[PDB]
Design a protein around this ligand. Structure first.
Ligand SMILES: Cc1cn([C@H]2C[C@H](O)[C@@H](COP(=O)(O)OP(=O)(O)OP(=O)(O)O)O2)c(=O)[nH]c1=O
Ligand SMILES: [Ca+2]
Ligand SMILES: [Ca+2]
Ligand SMILES: [Ca+2]
Ligand SMILES: [Ca+2]
Ligand SMILES: [Ca+2]
Ligand SMILES: [Ca+2]
Length: 903
DNA sequence: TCAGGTAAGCAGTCCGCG
DNA sequence: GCGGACTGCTTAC
């Protein structure tokens, strides 16, 4: 096997590297790496190094890394460009791994741990670390073992040994329901004192030093706590053994509001799973507690316990230890599903970066482009300082607020990256500028053709056409990877729908799930065998189909994130290739393409229906168009269809055979208009929407930009066994809206689109009548809480105080002088509820940490003074009024004349 | 909420709107 | 009441 790196660090004048050697063994080496940088020179000619612009460069080989860094400072003092990779470990990896890296994950030590620390006086601050660490579970992926370190004797209590036998038993037997599949994988180590616990942990850490270190909030809690605790007890040198190079750094993380401190452990890549989840999951949650995310991702219920956590070890150490083990497991289960570690490794090695750099598309692209250019002997430019300037983005059409019965959407494949490729936008393909006409002139094809020589964007920029730029070239590579995984995702989706179909008629027989690859469309053979399976086996298969879909989704959606991130990286001052000319060239081009093809679709459809000037495109956002299809359906007549699937077939055929060709023709013309290098505007049908045939459903509606709902039957080639509501923007999609309210609004929408005005009024009446039985948490609003301090004036709301902040301030007064009550954390999310006037809290609302029950100190009093009426109007009625009005219907039955009986 | 980008919606505060 | 200016927060793309 080829070697691969595990980690890389710069310490003084040494590169420190952990790696896997050609034998498959983990290794560590110190390399006094001498870096090279470059300077412009006259042709000469030496001379094999050229900058991206083609200007000749002399390589300057440095004695050590500090000389190289100091030289960069001198070149700035003098006012001259210091060229080349100034992040010296990237140059190191580039020289040391001059090939496409093939990693073997089973050789990489992925660790995930969680710790427990008991605290009577509130939250155990990692900076202080003044309380004993009384438990650590550390799973090791190489050993496949959960290592449990359990403190028996504490100032906060002396406990008995944990029982694995009691832990395995059901909650109903009195045990802790530790999953049977991990029981045998537990290595349990009890300790008589915390010193002996920490000493073994460090010895253990040394024998099995993590490469990849993860967990839930491990970066913000477990790592800083463990390091500081050890620091307080043994001294800093001992704490520093958490790093295989014995180097650590207190690092300050800045944001908009304040600053926290984390501990950088050199020679380890920390990928905090909460952070992977937030970057890669593409879900906005009301809470990021492990409990909450586990429920959502895995459908496993909350770990129940009586009393507060700060009394749990003392009252139930058995359960304490067991919940610490389950915590670690639940993260592994989430990763088994979402595969974010795999993803991170994939991308990290592809880019040749430190794995933890995957969180930064800027750092990822810097490296991909650097390695690409080094291969051609090209030298990268120096990073400059730029002032942050706003620039324009996409076009969003203003829709006429209305019901819309029949809709087909069309969408451009990977828009921004395709534009980069079509136009050939790169730092070194800039050819010049042309005199620009107002955008509408280019849209309506009446402006002077920008150029006869170069590939153009309507923002004024012209690009070379002889060769592909390094941005287009490299972005094409990641795009192709993305297209493979998306293939798998869509295939697993289709497969999922065939299984769902077969569930309508499950055979009565004891059998097993078929060994199949859900990444590929089911053969006719597999299809028939499925029609013969039991409900149990079909369900087990659906689950696997849905897991294959989620793995494909992660691999595809995040590659899409990386490629789109390049488009935006160009508009980021910290990026080596920041150029607002290039970022605006991408966005302006997109504005044109959309509005150009709106004009084209209108013309085609107006011609084919024999009308003049009617809008067929009702809406569009960034890269998609929504086309009214009422007139196409009405031409062949609604009564001419067998069932819903029949008109869905018909429109599918209309869109694939008549529409897309016309759209392709239109986009080809725009390519030759802008004189682009390559036609890559591919706009395929996405969704086909409408009511169930024979129903009073309205099909879909829009209330404004980014706010609409559609009843979808087919999406990207997936024919739904059950119609799917595609709701964009509306309150059902916002994390700030209550759960109960999301469900209810959704049902109201379902009824409007699938059933009609009457069915809608049935539900609203019933909801309104029962809503006061709903659990207080399921009707709380959620909100992130920033700048509580800013609006805090002596316990009371300052001027302009936000509603949710007032709720927090109210919560603070009610719990004042109590260290044990859960504190609201600045920057996290809170649940919010309105309070009836006259309450003992003395204000109109209260807030408390989301994902939690409100403390028993005030719960009863909160539940009593809860303003239901206000909740109903704000979160539910108002939004519903907005839907019903846009769609031209009523949620309350209005008074007619056909009713007054007997009169 | 350390970690590509812009567009644009809605809740709420404050206050004008004779 | 409702909107406009403004802050704060969230989603669509
Ligand atoms: C979803 C999304 C889109 N965009 C921009 C860039 C996209 O090219 C453009 C269109 O978005 P999308 O239509 O959502 O996706 P896409 O065209 O990039 O890729 P595909 O349709 O094949 O899945 O909007 C972002 O900048 N960030 C995002 O998170
Ligand atoms: Ca815990
Ligand atoms: Ca698209
Ligand atoms: Ca798409
Ligand atoms: Ca059957
Ligand atoms: Ca789209
Ligand atoms: Ca097509």
């Amino acid at each position: 096997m080829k070697e691969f790196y595990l980690t890389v660090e710069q310490i003084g004048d040494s590169i420190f590297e952990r790696y896997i050697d050609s034998n498959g063994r983990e290794r560590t080496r110190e390399v006094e790496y001498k870096p090279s940088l470059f300077a412009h020179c006259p042709e000469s000619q030496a001379t094999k190094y050229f900058d991206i612009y083609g200007k000749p460069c002399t390589r300057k080989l440095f004695a050590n890394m500090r000389d190289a860094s100091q030289w960069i400072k001198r070149m700035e003092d003098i006012g001259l460009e210091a060229l080349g990779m100034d992040d010296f470990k990237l140059a190191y990896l580039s020289d040391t791994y001059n090939y496409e890296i093939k990693y073997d994950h089973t050789k990489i030590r992925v660790a995930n741990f969680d710790i427990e620390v008991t605290s009577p006086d509130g939250f155990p601050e990692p900076s202080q670390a003044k309380h004993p660490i009384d438990a650590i579970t550390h799973y090791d992926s190489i050993d496949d073992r959960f290592y449990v370190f359990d403190l028996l004797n504490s100032p906060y209590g002396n406990v008995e040994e944990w029982s694995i036998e009691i832990a395995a038993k059901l909650q109903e037997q009195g045990g802790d329901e530790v999953p049977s599949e991990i029981i045998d994988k537990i290595i349990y180590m009890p300790f008589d004192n915390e010193k002996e616990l920490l000493m073994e942990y460090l010895n253990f850490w040394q024998q099995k030093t993590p490469v990849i270190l993860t967990g839930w909030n491990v970066e913000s809690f477990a790592i800083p706590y463990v390091y500081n605790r050890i620091k307080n007890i043994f001294g800093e040198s001992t704490a520093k053994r958490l790093s295989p190079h014995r180097k650590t750094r207190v690092k300050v993380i800045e944001n908009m509001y304040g600053s926290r401190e984390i501990i950088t452990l050199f020679g380890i890549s920390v990928l905090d799973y909460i952070d992977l989840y937030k970057k890669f999951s593409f879900t906005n949650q009301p809470s990021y507690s492990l409990d909450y995310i586990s429920e959502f991702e895995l459908n496993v219920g909350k770990l129940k316990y009586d009393g507060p956590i700060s009394k749990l070890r003392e009252s139930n150490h058995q359960r304490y230890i067991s919940y610490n083990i389950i915590a670690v497991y639940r993260v592994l289960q989430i990763d088994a599903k979402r595969q974010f570690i795999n993803l991170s490794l994939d991308m990290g090695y592809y880019a040749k970066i430190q794995i933890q750099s995957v969180f930064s598309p800027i750092k990822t692209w810097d490296a991909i482009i650097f390695n690409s250019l080094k291969e051609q002997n090209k030298v990268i430019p120096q990073g400059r300082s730029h002032p942050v300037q706003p620039y324009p983005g996409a076009f969003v059409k203003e829709p006429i607020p209305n019901r819309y019965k029949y809709v087909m959407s069309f969408d451009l494949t990977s828009l921004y990256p395709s534009i980069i490729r079509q136009v050939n936008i790169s730092p070194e393909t800039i050819a010049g500028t042309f005199k620009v006409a107002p955008l509408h002139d280019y849209i309506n094809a009446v402006a002077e053709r920008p150029s006869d020589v170069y590939s153009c964007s309507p923002n004024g920029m012209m690009y070379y056409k002889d060769r592909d730029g390094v941005v287009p070239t490299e972005i094409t590579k990641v795009f192709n990877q993305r297209k493979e995984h998306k293939g798998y995702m869509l295939a697993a989706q289709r497969n999922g729908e065939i299984i769902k179909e077969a569930l309508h008629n499950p055979n009565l027989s004891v059998d097993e799930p078929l060994d199949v690859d859900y990444r590929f469309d089911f053969s006719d053979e597999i299809k028939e065998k499925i029609k013969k399976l039991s409900a149990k086996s079909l369900n087990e298969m659906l689950f696997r189909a849905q897991r294959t879909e989620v793995a494909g989704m992660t691999a595809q959606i995040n590659r899409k994130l990386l490629i789109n991130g390049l488009a935006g990286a160009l508009g980021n001052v910290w990026f080596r290739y920041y150029d607002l000319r290039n970022a605006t060239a991408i966005t302006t081009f997109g504005q044109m393409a959309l509005q150009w093809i709106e004009r084209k679709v209108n013309e085609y459809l107006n011609e084919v229906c024999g009308t003049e000037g009617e809008a067929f495109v009702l809406y569009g956002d960034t890269d998609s168009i929504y086309v009214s299809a009422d007139k196409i359906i009405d031409k062949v007549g609604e009564s001419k269809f067998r069932d819903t699937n029949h008109w869905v077939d018909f429109l599918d055929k209309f869109a694939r055979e008549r529409m897309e060709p016309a759209i392709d023709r239109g986009f080809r013309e725009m390519c030759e208009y802008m004189n682009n290098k390559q036609h890559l505007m591919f706009m395929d049908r996405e969704a086909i929407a409408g009511p169930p045939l024979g129903s009073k459903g309205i099909g879909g509606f829009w209330t404004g930009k980014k706010r609409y709902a559609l009843n979808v039957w087919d999406m990207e080639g997936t024919r739904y066994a059950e119609p799917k509501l595609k709701i964009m923007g509306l309150e059902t999609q916002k994390s700030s809206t209550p759960k109960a309210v999301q469900k209810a609004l959704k049902e109201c929408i379902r009824r409007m689109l699938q059933e009609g005005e009457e069915s809608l009024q049935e539900y609203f009446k019933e909801f309104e009548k029962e809503f006061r039985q709903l659990n207080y948490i399921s009707i709380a609003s959620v909100s992130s809480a920033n700048n509580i301090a800013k609006y805090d004036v002596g316990g009371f709301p300052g001027p302009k105080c936000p509603f949710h902040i007032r709720g927090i301030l109210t919560y603070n007064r009610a719990i004042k002088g109590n260290i044990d009550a859960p504190q609201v954390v600045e920057g996290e999310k809170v649940y919010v509820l309105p309070l009836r006037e006259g309450n003992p809290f003395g204000d109109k609302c209260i807030a408390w940490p989301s994902g939690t029950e409100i403390t028993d100190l005030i719960k009863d009093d909160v539940l009593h003074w809860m303003d239901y009426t206000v909740l109903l109007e704000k979160t539910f009625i108002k939004p519903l009024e907005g839907f019903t009005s846009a769609a031209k219907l009523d949620y309350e039955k209005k008074a007619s004349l056909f009713d007054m009986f007997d009169f």
